[PDB]
Structure formats: structure tokens, C-alpha cells
Amino acid sequence: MHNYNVDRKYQYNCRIGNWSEEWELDEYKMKEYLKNKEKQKLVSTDKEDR
Amino acid sequence: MREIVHIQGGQCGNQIGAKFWEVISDEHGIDPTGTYHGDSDLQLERINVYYNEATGGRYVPRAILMDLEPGTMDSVRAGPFGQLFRPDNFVFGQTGAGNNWAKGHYTEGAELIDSVLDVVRKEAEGCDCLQGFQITHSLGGGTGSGMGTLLISKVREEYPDRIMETFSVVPSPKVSDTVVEPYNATLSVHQLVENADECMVIDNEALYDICFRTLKLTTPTYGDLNHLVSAAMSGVTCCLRFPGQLNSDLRKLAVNLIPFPRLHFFMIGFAPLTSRGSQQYRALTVPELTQQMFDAKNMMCAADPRHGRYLTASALFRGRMSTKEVDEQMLNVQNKNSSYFVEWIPNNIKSSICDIPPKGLKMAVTFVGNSTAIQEMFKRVAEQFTAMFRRKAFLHWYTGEGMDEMEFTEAESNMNDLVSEYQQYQDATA
Amino acid sequence: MREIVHIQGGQCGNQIGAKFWEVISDEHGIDPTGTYHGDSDLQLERINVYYNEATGGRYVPRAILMDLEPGTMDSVRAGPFGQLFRPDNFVFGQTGAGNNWAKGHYTEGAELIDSVLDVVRKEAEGCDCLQGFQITHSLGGGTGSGMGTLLISKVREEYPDRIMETFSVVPSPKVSDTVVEPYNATLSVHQLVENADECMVIDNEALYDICFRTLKLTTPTYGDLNHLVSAAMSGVTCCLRFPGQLNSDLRKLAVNLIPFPRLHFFMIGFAPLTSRGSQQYRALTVPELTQQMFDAKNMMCAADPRHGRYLTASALFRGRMSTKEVDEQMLNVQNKNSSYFVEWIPNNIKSSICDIPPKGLKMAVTFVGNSTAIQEMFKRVAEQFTAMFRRKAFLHWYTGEGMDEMEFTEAESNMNDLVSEYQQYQDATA
Amino acid sequence: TQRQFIANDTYFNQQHYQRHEIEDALARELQR
Amino acid sequence: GEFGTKPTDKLNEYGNEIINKHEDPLKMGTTKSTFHIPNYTGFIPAARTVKSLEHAAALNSRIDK
Amino acid sequence: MREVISIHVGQGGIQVGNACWELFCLEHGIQPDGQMPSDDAFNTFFSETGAGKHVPRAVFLDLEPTVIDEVRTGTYRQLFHPEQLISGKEDAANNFARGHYTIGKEIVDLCLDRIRKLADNCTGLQGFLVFNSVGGGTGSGLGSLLLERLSVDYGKKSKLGFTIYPSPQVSTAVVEPYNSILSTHSLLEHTDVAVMLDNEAIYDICRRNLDIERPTYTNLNRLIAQVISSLTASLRFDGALNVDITEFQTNLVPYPRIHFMLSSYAPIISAEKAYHEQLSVAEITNSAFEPANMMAKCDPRHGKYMACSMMYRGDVVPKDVNASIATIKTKRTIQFVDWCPTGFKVGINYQPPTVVPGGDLAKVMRAVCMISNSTAIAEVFSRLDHKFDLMYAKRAFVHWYVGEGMEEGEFSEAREDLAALEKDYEEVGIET
Amino acid sequence: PTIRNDIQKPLMKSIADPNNYGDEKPAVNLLFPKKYDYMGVEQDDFKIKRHKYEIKDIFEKIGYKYKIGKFEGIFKRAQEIENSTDNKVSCSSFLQAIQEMDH
Numbered sequence A: 001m002h003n004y005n006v007d008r009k010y011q012y013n014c015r016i017g018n019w020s021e022e023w024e025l026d027e028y029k030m031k032e033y034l035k036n037k038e039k040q041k042l043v044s045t046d047k048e049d050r
Numbered sequence B, C: 001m002r003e004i005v006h007i008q009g010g011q012c013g014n015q016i017g018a019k020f021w022e023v024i025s026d027e028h029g030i031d032p033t034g035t036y037h038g039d040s041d042l043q044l045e046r047i048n049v050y051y052n053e054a055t056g057g058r059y060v061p062r063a064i065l066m067d068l069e070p071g072t073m074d075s076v077r078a079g080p081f082g083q084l085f086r087p088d089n090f091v092f093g094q095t096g097a098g099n100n101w102a103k104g105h106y107t108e109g110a111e112l113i114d115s116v117l118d119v120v121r122k123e124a125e126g127c128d129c130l131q132g133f134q135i136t137h138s139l140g141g142g143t144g145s146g147m148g149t150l151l152i153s154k155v156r157e158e159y160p161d162r163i164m165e166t167f168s169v170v171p172s173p174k175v176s177d178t179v180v181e182p183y184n185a186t187l188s189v190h191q192l193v194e195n196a197d198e199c200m201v202i203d204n205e206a207l208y209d210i211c212f213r214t215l216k217l218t219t220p221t222y223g224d225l226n227h228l229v230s231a232a233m234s235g236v237t238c239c240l241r242f243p244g245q246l247n248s249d250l251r252k253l254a255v256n257l258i259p260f261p262r263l264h265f266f267m268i269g270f271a272p273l274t275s276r277g278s279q280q281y282r283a284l285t286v287p288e289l290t291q292q293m294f295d296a297k298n299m300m301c302a303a304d305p306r307h308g309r310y311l312t313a314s315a316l317f318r319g320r321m322s323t324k325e326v327d328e329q330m331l332n333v334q335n336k337n338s339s340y341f342v343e344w345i346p347n348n349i350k351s352s353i354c355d356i357p358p359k360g361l362k363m364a365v366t367f368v369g370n371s372t373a374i375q376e377m378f379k380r381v382a383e384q385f386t387a388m389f390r391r392k393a394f395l396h397w398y399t400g401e402g403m404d405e406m407e408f409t410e411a412e413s414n415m416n417d418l419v420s421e422y423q424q425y426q427d428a429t430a
Numbered sequence D: 001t002q003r004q005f006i007a008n009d010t011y012f013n014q015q016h017y018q019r020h021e022i023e024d025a026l027a028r029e030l031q032r
Numbered sequence E: 001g002e003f004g005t006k007p008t009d010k011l012n013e014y015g016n017e018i019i020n021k022h023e024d025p026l027k028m029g030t031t032k033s034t035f036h037i038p039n040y041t042g043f044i045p046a047a048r049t050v051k052s053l054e055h056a057a058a059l060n061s062r063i064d065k
Numbered sequence F: 001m002r003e004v005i006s007i008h009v010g011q012g013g014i015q016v017g018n019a020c021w022e023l024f025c026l027e028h029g030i031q032p033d034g035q036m037p038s039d040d041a042f043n044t045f046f047s048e049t050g051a052g053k054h055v056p057r058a059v060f061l062d063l064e065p066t067v068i069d070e071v072r073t074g075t076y077r078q079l080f081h082p083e084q085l086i087s088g089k090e091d092a093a094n095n096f097a098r099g100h101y102t103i104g105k106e107i108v109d110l111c112l113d114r115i116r117k118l119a120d121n122c123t124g125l126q127g128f129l130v131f132n133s134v135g136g137g138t139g140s141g142l143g144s145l146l147l148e149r150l151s152v153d154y155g156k157k158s159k160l161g162f163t164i165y166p167s168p169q170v171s172t173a174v175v176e177p178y179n180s181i182l183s184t185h186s187l188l189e190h191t192d193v194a195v196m197l198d199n200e201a202i203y204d205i206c207r208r209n210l211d212i213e214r215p216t217y218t219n220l221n222r223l224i225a226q227v228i229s230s231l232t233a234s235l236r237f238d239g240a241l242n243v244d245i246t247e248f249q250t251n252l253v254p255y256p257r258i259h260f261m262l263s264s265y266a267p268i269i270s271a272e273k274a275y276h277e278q279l280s281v282a283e284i285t286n287s288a289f290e291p292a293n294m295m296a297k298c299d300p301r302h303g304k305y306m307a308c309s310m311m312y313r314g315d316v317v318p319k320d321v322n323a324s325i326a327t328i329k330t331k332r333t334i335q336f337v338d339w340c341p342t343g344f345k346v347g348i349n350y351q352p353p354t355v356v357p358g359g360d361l362a363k364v365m366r367a368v369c370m371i372s373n374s375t376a377i378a379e380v381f382s383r384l385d386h387k388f389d390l391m392y393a394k395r396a397f398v399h400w401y402v403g404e405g406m407e408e409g410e411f412s413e414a415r416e417d418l419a420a421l422e423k424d425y426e427e428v429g430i431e432t
Numbered sequence G: 001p002t003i004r005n006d007i008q009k010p011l012m013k014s015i016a017d018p019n020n021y022g023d024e025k026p027a028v029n030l031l032f033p034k035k036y037d038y039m040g041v042e043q044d045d046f047k048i049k050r051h052k053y054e055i056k057d058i059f060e061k062i063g064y065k066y067k068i069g070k071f072e073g074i075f076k077r078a079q080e081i082e083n084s085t086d087n088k089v090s091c092s093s094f095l096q097a098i099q100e101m102d103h
């Protein structure tokens, strides 16, 4: 019966609550950013090439 | 989830709390500046139990400091780890209780305790899930003996179903520095037995004996005793803060240790303890740990454990070992010391395993036990109290602030019948 | 498995034990820091018989050093092989005994024995399977014979089924160092006969004699004398620590050489012994080994074997040799000296073979024997005792510590009774 | 924090686990 | 096992396991820590240091007498 | 934040007060002109002026100007407040009635106004320290009057009196047994704690330990100042076991009428024979219980002990005190009362004592100061009672008192109060 | 003084010596020994800088072996991490230098 939105929250490292969902999004955030390396469409690449 | 708050009062309690935070911060790898500089993820997995964090990611302990004088607070804020504590939590008076239970509970503590009770309400409402309270205080001193027990009463009144911890150092007849110790001790225990769920008893002379005998260091100081007490404290909640083969929280300990509601006075000890010159000769094994655990001199209390029979025993194992070996050791010691264990309850030893040992050690065990041997402490304190009270010595300070001898007589009765019903089970047989 | 614990008490006991651990450690290839450095596989298989493992790879003996004066242990620790001993096992008094049996057995050793009894219990329970005890002590000294024999009784009543041996250096009238030797010597043997399972006597006078006629060194000292005793000690349990053709543990020795429960005083001897200059000339063979071991001069005590009748004898052979050449040579002396072996226990020779000879020697034989010749040793001590007792000389020292003349009379009667029953077997015929 | 550990499928705690076995081995060699 | 590790990762190309005998704290001082056949009653050292290991391992059979 | 006010009255009180303020300046490094060349420990005795100098928190009161004018013309002129030195014109001249009914009435108004001007500045006032010699006119006359006025104006503030009672067999005045008892009646119900500081004991201390065969009053006053510094040392210095002024009467007073106590100090040695002894904690605490070392001419072996508040300043270790105290209890010549099982209140401080340049004392790592309450103090009240009855039986020296406005019958109440006090000591001492 | 740090102390303890020499370890260290206090090796050994000829031997004794040229590179970058004038490098610092490398 663990409940979310329990007033103030810690970081995602702690296991207070809603850490798994937050961790999954953060993990996928760089995997998309990893895909940004797979296909040469990084804005950093554009400015470094610039 | 299941966090607990820490509140301390008096000079002795403040020192105990300061060194406990010392040990806990070192264990969790927190820079005195409040910044996490740890190395493993397990250090941060269960930090919510003892710590909150503010803006910027720095962590702060949820500790509240109370006193009637600013002498100890200014000394503890100027030392190491003195900046973790949130500054508003420093709530204190300006005059002092003057080693008087009446002054610390009726005149000055009563008027000042409103602010500290407000801030503890704030912390309890802020925390996700209050699991219990823990308090450090001394039964001898004025401000501690009064305000600690008054605040226990108020906290229990507002929170009926929570767990109360009191690591209390009782006065001793050998090492005594105050003349009116028995009065305050009796008045404190009278209110303490009524409200507190768990009470930890510690003796100054027992710590001195341990330091002189086991560690064999020539010059003990108050810092070393505080450090030993702090290690014992952390050993209790290690199992809650870290995973293990058999997890055990505070609630499980109370159920498995308390047969009847009024019998909640426990003695604690720590293993291993070795001297510097003999630390490399010893072998860290479970049988050695159990032998040192059941060693009578290892208990941090002056009670003689072999002068009475154990009701229940509990051992919390820190470090990684095998379950079967510890199980068999517990059975073996149970069979070997049947005379020192009560016979109408079977399998009266509780065992738990926590896989994270203390820093710098591969294995460690925290021991807590409930035995009739503690009656000697109350008997020796009662003997002094009645001897001083028969002549009504030093009584008009207590009677000068609304108290009367009737309250003292009632307090004596509540102590005496407690001893009687505690020793009744020693000779009660099935 | 079947390991034994060592306890050394008194000045002489510590001196004997100081060289004993030096001999064993070199045999097992253990440096004085406890780091194993052996060259053969067999030197590690039975290390646990005498040594305990500690974390870090070092080894520590399971020996307890006890005395009532701290001076002797101050010297042995600083000497070679002094770092092996566990600093915890060092237990000492504060005032000393002053060669007074009553002081070292009734008044001062009584309260000190609590600490020494706790540590020996800790060692005894640590081992998986206890085998026995070995004690080194002096019967002519106060603390050596007083606290020594007191520990004999306390240990025996706690482990009635384990075996237990003692190495006692009885006083010799020719080499006399104290004026009150007859008193405490008589008292100590009174308790020793009732409790000790095995006892092996020693005289310093014989040690001086053996050094002169066999080793012919001009300047002996206590170090050389202790070496002869230490070599004999290691011989008895050598076949226990190493495989052999016919293994013979300590219980093997007890059953064969003890015809009756109270006849447990033995005669010891070690062979071969050779001077430095004649080492190359002599041929080390079984005929030579048997001839030298049976020499009355080779006996380690002042007792004269050819003045009595051998009850039983035992020989432990170390080294590789045909088992037969041991056999008929035992019969060779047995039939050639039929007047020197008891007729109603025919074939009274114990022979055991161990395949590991001492370091530096190819063959060696340790001989321990039970003979009627020990009566003169007890007869002469009783002669001195009753001569100095009739005038009640030096008696006020012992009567000032709660001991009465009834105790003195009983002990001399028992020693007189022991001699009488021990020699009637000499006159016994089938 | 240089969260390199999630690029390849390796757990974050590997960074100091393998550190100590090397550091444990060094201590044992120094002891001998 | 920990995240990212298959249960079969600790195997060689032949399929046999890779055994580090002295790594496990539990089995040290037991027959599996050494190469002896089970029920061997000789003393096995407890602590581990980089000369007793070679003698205690007994990889090859002892020399006949 | 914690402050105390010092009241000096009479020549005896003043001539020991200036010695005390010499010692206090050295401890905090305040120069005699008041400036400090180069944390706020001084706040208990001094108050910052806003820019520079620190002024003492004490008021000097006297009816004769000889001693006060000595201070004003001395090198400590610039330290004290100019209007905090109250002086009169006519001496009391060994007459108690003059200081309590004739001249002391016109000066007490001025002193109370200044004390009021000093208490409002303070915020955490702890109590009062008043110094006065009992066997004198203005010392006993004004001292009684100030105690009466302060007790109603301030009330619950604890007042500590460091009185110097007349010596048993030697004395300066001839009629001092008269006015010693008269002031005894006043201080019994108006001061919290009184300390016995006669001169005979201090003479013996200088002769045996310091080997001073002909000491002057200044040597006596320096020794007294050291005791006062030790008592206050826990207030202004961090320590392992701090003790406050309010934590004295809660632990030293068994019954409200029994609050007379005597002190001791150790070690007291010169700087050349200090090389030959180690001054261990075990032996300095034994010298404290030597009956010859009591600051009052009383033999404690003639009575029981009630309580003992003894303090160590220096680098003492808490374990050492318990070892030393345990030996004391095992000793048989020192016995306590039966209804007080534990009687030691011990404090430890980290501040070793200082020494004045050119002083007799030597600087050491350890010192112990004691305040002890014992039943043996009943003798001193009896011996003054015996002396008073001898003279009053023929009404000697009485016409000087009745003619100054005091009733003849007042001597009856003063005498009957001492007899009542004696009845209390003999009643409490008996076993139960 | 309570602790005798000006007595030059004796090399051999008299088993019954009741005074302190300033080398006593506080219980804070005793309760949590500094990692390797049970092996007789104290960690103020890694900080002593060592030359390459013995560091290499130590590390092949451990089990880490590198070909020449690679070893001089790791030694030089360990020295760079140390940033000390002497060529000798601390063993621990060389360990973190390897930890940075191997990829």
C-alpha cells in the first residue's frame, strides 16, 4: 500500500517512493541521447563541426 | 518510510548524541559539511531513516537538542560535525535546572518545553512515516531527569502507537559526583516505567571496567565511553538501515523481548572488543563472538547476569556469515547454560543477521537481554533514597516548587513493587 | 584433533616451558613470529595439536603462563621465541609466595585462581576434541607447588574423563637451595597422587651428572639442563604429531605402564647423548641405542634403578628402521636381565615407532619407565621432613595461614603409606 | 556524476568492488 | 547475480565452471577449499596469505614411502 | 551572559578585595589601566565600556576614607569607576550601633542606587559576593544593613558571604565578641552561604607549607583570592564537569539553618621545594583533608561530615578523582553522617591556576579547592558564646552601645539565637 | 604530566607498567580498527614513494604484468599524478594510475 507524492521528496538514489519510475525515465533519457550519438544529429556535433 | 527522530537532553545525553551522530555520519560517509562523499550505493539507499536533505542536496540530521543552559550547546556546536545540526533546533534556556528534578520538570522545563514540543511536532509531521522515538538522558542530572521524562510523557500522549527508546545512564554508588542522585533517579524511573516502551540502562563504572579490562587502555576519558555507547546505539538500527538474511525492525525486537508490559528494562553490550597489542592474535569466528557476548564482563551494566536467570535474549549479527552456524551456536549455549535461563519458555534467544558489518570490522554483534539481574540496580538506589528520605534531607528545594512528600512516597512505592514483581518471575516455576 | 593444552607455573616451570616451545617450533618449521616455513608436507598435518590458527597467517601456542611474581615473565618474553605467546594468557600475582606453601595454596592463590581457571576453560572449550593436560612445575617451591597442585585438583574435578600429566622437579638433598624444601615437597605430593594421572620426576643433581659423564661439557647452565628435559618432553608426543609404524598416543602409554591406579610415578630417559668430540666415532645403531637407554647413569633422576625391580618399561623409537630389530633387542635385555624385570607381569615392554626423527639426528629413543627404585627418592625426603618436623622448626609460618598440624601429620602418613604399599610389590611373588 | 555505467549494461557498483580485491592483494603481499 | 549479468556468464567456452577455491570465506578451512578428497581430517589453514597454501593444497598425490 | 556583583564593606573586606582584583586582572590579561593589548570569559567580572577598557563589577563601601584614598592614589586609579568608590567621613570605631543606627543609615541609600545601576546592565545575573570582617564596626554594621535591604529588593538571588571571624585566642580589638554576635543574628536568615575565614588558620598555613615565619596581611589576602578564583573558575572557563553558583546550595545545604561551611586549598608550595615532589592527584587530595590545612581554626575530627564540594582545576583526569575519592571512603579517620551515603560533589576544570609575578605561590598543573559542611563547626559558636557571657555578666562596654540608639535588651535576642543554632547542630548530628 | 611524553619510554614493556607514554590508541580507533590492523600491516606504507624497479616486481608478484614501454608509460603518468620532483612514486598512487588506465 506504498503511496506516492508523500509531501517533499529525496533524490532518485533513495528508495523512498516513485524511485523506479523516475530511474527508468532517467535511464531512458540518455539511451535516447545514446541514439543521438548513433545517428549524427547531435547539436554538439553541429557546433563542434562549426 | 519508517524513519525515527532523535532528541537529546542534558550534558551526558548531548555528548552521547554527538558521538552517535559522529558514528552514523562516518558509517554513511557524509562530509561534516553535509555533502555526500560516499563510495557505494548502499550508503544512500536507506538514508531517509536518520537524515533529511535541504536545498542544494546537502543532508541534515533530524535531531533536536534541549537544555536549560547554553554551556554544552556552545561546546558541541564548535566541535567536529557541529554544523550538520539545523541551527533552529538549538532550543535552550538561560538559567539552568541546578541538579533539581523539580526545577527541570515543574517551573522552568514546563514553560520552555512548548517550543521544543512544537518543533518535534513539526519534524514528526514532516517525516513520511514516524517509526519511533529515541532519547538520550541521564537519571542523575537535573535538566535531563526532568525534561526528558516530561517530554516522554507529552510525546506518548500525542502518539499512542509509536515506539519509545530511552538510552538512560543510571547513577552508580561507586562513581558518584552528585549528592542528590537517588531522589532524581527514583522520580525519573517512576514516570519512565509508566510511559517508555524500551529503556536502555548503562553504568559509568561498567564502562570504566570494560576499558580497563578488555581494551586495556591506561587512560579512559569521557570520549571513549561516549564512543562505546554510540557503537552500541548504531548496532541496534543497523539491521533496519541495511539488508540482511533475517531483517528485524524495532517493533519485532520489542515483541520478542517483552513478555509483560511492565518488564521493559534491557541491558546491552557490544562485541568484539580487543586491545591494540592483542588484536592480531585473535581469530574472528562465531564461537569466539558468542563467548565474548555471553561473557559477564562484556555487559555495559553493573548488574551481575549470573546472579539471575535470563528471561529473553537477542543478538544482532553484523557482517556476513552462515545462518546454520549461528543457529547451532545459539542452541549450544542454550543447552550449556540451562540454569541461567528460565525454564517455562522454550527457545528464548532471538537471532538476526545483517550483512553489512561496521566500518573497519569484518564481524560484529550487538547483544540485548532481559534478565532479573537488573533488580540489584534498583535495590542499591532505593537503599540510598530511603536512607536520605527518612531524615528528609535536602527536601525543601523539592517541596519549594509545588511538590510534597506524598509524591516521593508514591514514587518509592512504584519502584518497590516493580522490583518485587520483577523478581517474582525469577522464582516462579512451571 | 585430540589436542592438549599446556600450563607452566612457577619460576622453574616457565624456564622449562621457555625451551620446550623453542624445540617444538623448530621441529614444525615455525619461526618465532608464527609464520609457517616448513619444508615437508607432514609438518603441517598435525599443527593444531599444539598451535592455534589466527587471522593473518600466524600461529600461536595454546600455552598459559602463570606465576605469582611478574619478574620471570618479563624476561622470557624479551627472549627468543617470546613473541609467540598470547599477551592475554600472561597472568601474574602482585606480592610473590616466598617459597611458602600455605601462602601459595590457601591465602593468596585462592583468589588469583579465578582468572587462571577462566582462561584455561576458554582454551579447553575452543578445541574440537580435548585429549589431556601437561603441567610443568616445581615441588620444592612455594608458588610452583602450591598454586600448581591447586590447579591439578580444580581441573580434574571438572574433566574427570580426560587424562592429565605433570612434569615435577622434586627437590634433591645433595643439591639443596632452600631450608624448607621438605615441608612443601611432602604437602604437594599428597595432593598430586590423588589427582594427577601421570607424573614424571626430575632431579637437578642427575642433570648435572648426565652432563658430566656423557656430554662432558665443563660449563653447564640452566639452558642446557632445560634442553635435556625439553627433548624428553617432545619425545613422548612425537608419535602423536607424526605418522608411524605403530602409533601410540598418551592414553596408550597410560594403560600399559599403570598396573594400579595409584602407581603413576615414572622414570624418564633420553637417548642417544653424545659429546661434541666423539660424535663422528660412535656408530648410531639400534644395539647402541638400547644399551645407552637402559644405563642407570642415563636416568634423568637420582634414583638408582639397579636397587629395585622394574615393573613396566616403554620405549618410543623415532626414525626409520626395521621394526623387528626393536623387538628382539627388547627381549635380549629382558632375558639377560631377568632378575631386573618383575616376573608376575611377563613381557612388560612397550615399543612404539615414529617415522620422523629429531632435527639433526637420524635415530633417537625416548624412554619412560616404572620401577620400584623411586622409594629411595621418597624415603629421603621423608627422612628430612620428620627430622625437621619433630622440633617444629619453621612451623609458625605455615600455622599462621590457617593450616594446622593435623594436615601436616596426614600428608606424611600418606607419603609413608605410599612407600609401604609401593615396595610390597617388589617382594611380591607368584 | 559521469554516469558512464549505464552506457554499457554494467552495474554502478563495479567501480570500487574490483578496486578492493587489487588493494586487498597488495596488502597481503606487503604483509609477507 | 547483479543487474546486467546473466546466470551463465561465469562459465568458460567449454561450459565448465571457473573455480577460485580460496576466494569464498565460507569454504576456507574445509575440504572444498583444498584439493583433498572429502573426510580428510588434516588441519587446513584458516587465514590466507600469499607458503602454507602450496603444502595445504596437495594438488599432487603424496610421495610413497 | 553570566555575571556576579561584588560588594566590599569595611577595611577587612576592602584590603582583601583589591588583592582579589589583582588576581582577576592577571587571569584575563587586562592591564591595570583597563585596556587589553591583544573568548568573552571576562564577562562574569568585567563589562565592556564600548571602546577599549573593561571596568570591574564591584562597589567599594566604607565610612573611613583612609583605605579608599589609598586606592584612588594608587596605580589602580584608572581601573575602577570613579563614582563606584563610596566613602564617608566619620569612622564607625568598633561600634556596631554606629554603623547600624547612626551613620550607616545615610550611606546605604547611595550604595543601593549604584547596585541598581549595575544590575540593569547585567542580563544573566547569578548572585552576589559580599566581603566583610565580622569583628568590626562598619564590617558588621553596614554588612547587616546591606543584607537586610538586598534580601527584600532582589529576593531570590543567592548571596554568598566571605566573612572573617575573630581568631580563637588572638585578636586585634577587645570588644569584638560583642559586635560579632550582633551581626551573627543578621546574617543567619539573610545570606545563603557563609564561609569561615579566621586568621589563625592562615597563619599556620604560611608557617608550615610556605615557611613564612613573619607574614603580613597581604600574604593572607593573596591566599584568599586564589580560593575565590577557583570557586568562580567553573563559571568563566570550559571544563569537563562545570558547576554553577546555583548548584551549591542544592548540594551543600541539608537544612535551611545549616549553611555555615569552612574551606581548604592545596597545593601551597614554594618554587624551590616543588622540584622534590610530583604533586600527583592522589596526594594533593590527601593534603586537602589534613585538619591542619582547614582555613578555619576547627578540628573536623571532632564531628561528622555532611557534604563536600571539592573542585579540581588543571589537567586532572576524571578517572583519577574516583580512584582518590574511593580511598577516602575506605579511610576510617574520616567518617560521614549516617543519613548521607554519598557526600562528594566534584567538578573538573581545564584552567590551571595563575600566579602573580613576585608572589609566594608557585605555578603547577593541579590545584584543589574545597567547600565542606561539617558538624564540627559548632565549637566556634560556643567559644565566642563563652567569651560574650564573661563580659556581659557585668555589663562591660555597654554604655557605648545603649547611647547610640540601640535598645539594651537587644543583646538578649542576639545571645538566644546562637543558643538556638547550637541546639540545631547537636540535634542533627545524632544518629537515627 | 598525566601522560609521560618526556620520559623517552622503554623499548620493552614491563607487563605491569601503569603509566602512559603518549602512544596509547584512543577507543575511537580501537572500536573500528583502520582496515588492516589485524594483518600487522599499517596503511602508512602505500604513501611511501617507491622506484619503478621495485614497483614492477611488487605488481608482477600480485599478478599484474605489463610489457616494457607500457610499464614506463604507466609509471610516468603515475608520477604525473603524484606531481613530485623525485622519480619514485607511491604504490597507492600508481594503483589509482592503473585504475584510470587499462582502457
Ligand SMILES: Nc1nc2c(ncn2[C@@H]2O[C@H](COP(=O)(O)OP(=O)(O)OP(=O)(O)O)[C@@H](O)[C@H]2O)c(=O)[nH]1
Binding pocket: F009, F010, F011, F012, F013, F015, F016, F064, F091, F092, F093, F094, F095, F133, F135, F136, F137, F138, F139, F140, F164, F165, F166, F171, F172, F173, F176, F199, F217, F220, F221
Ligand atoms: N584576613 C584579614 N583580616 C583583616 C584584615 N584587616 C582587618 N582584618 C580583620 O578585621 C578585624 C577588625 O576590623 P577592621 O577590619 O580592622 O575594621 P572594619 O572592619 O573596617 O570596621 P571598623 O572598626 O568600623 O573600621 C580584625 O579582627 C581582623 O581580623 C586583613 O587585611 N586581612
Ligand SMILES: Nc1nc2c(ncn2[C@@H]2O[C@H](COP(=O)(O)OP(=O)(O)O)[C@@H](O)[C@H]2O)c(=O)[nH]1
Binding pocket: B009, B010, B011, B012, B015, B099, B138, B140, B141, B142, B143, B144, B145, B169, B171, B175, B176, B177, B178, B204, B222, B223, B225, B226
Ligand atoms: N558517559 C558519559 N557520562 C557522563 C558524561 N558527563 C557526565 N556524565 C554522567 O552524568 C552524571 C551527571 O549528570 P549531569 O551532567 O548533571 O546531567 P544534566 O544535569 O542533565 O546535564 C554523572 O554521574 C556522570 O557520570 C559524559 O560525557 N559521558
Ligand SMILES: Nc1nc2c(ncn2[C@@H]2O[C@H](COP(=O)(O)OP(=O)(O)O)[C@@H](O)[C@H]2O)c(=O)[nH]1
Binding pocket: C010, C011, C012, C015, C016, C097, C098, C099, C138, C140, C141, C142, C143, C144, C145, C169, C177, C204, C222, C223, C225, C226
Ligand atoms: N631445570 C631448571 N630448574 C630450575 C631453574 N630455575 C630454578 N630451578 C629449580 O627450581 C628450584 C627453586 O624453585 P622456585 O623457583 O623457588 O619455586 P617457586 O618459588 O614456586 O617459584 C631450584 O631447586 C632449582 O633447582 C631452571 O631454569 N631450570
Ligand SMILES: [Mg+2]
Binding pocket: F010, F011, F012, F064
Ligand atoms: Mg576600618
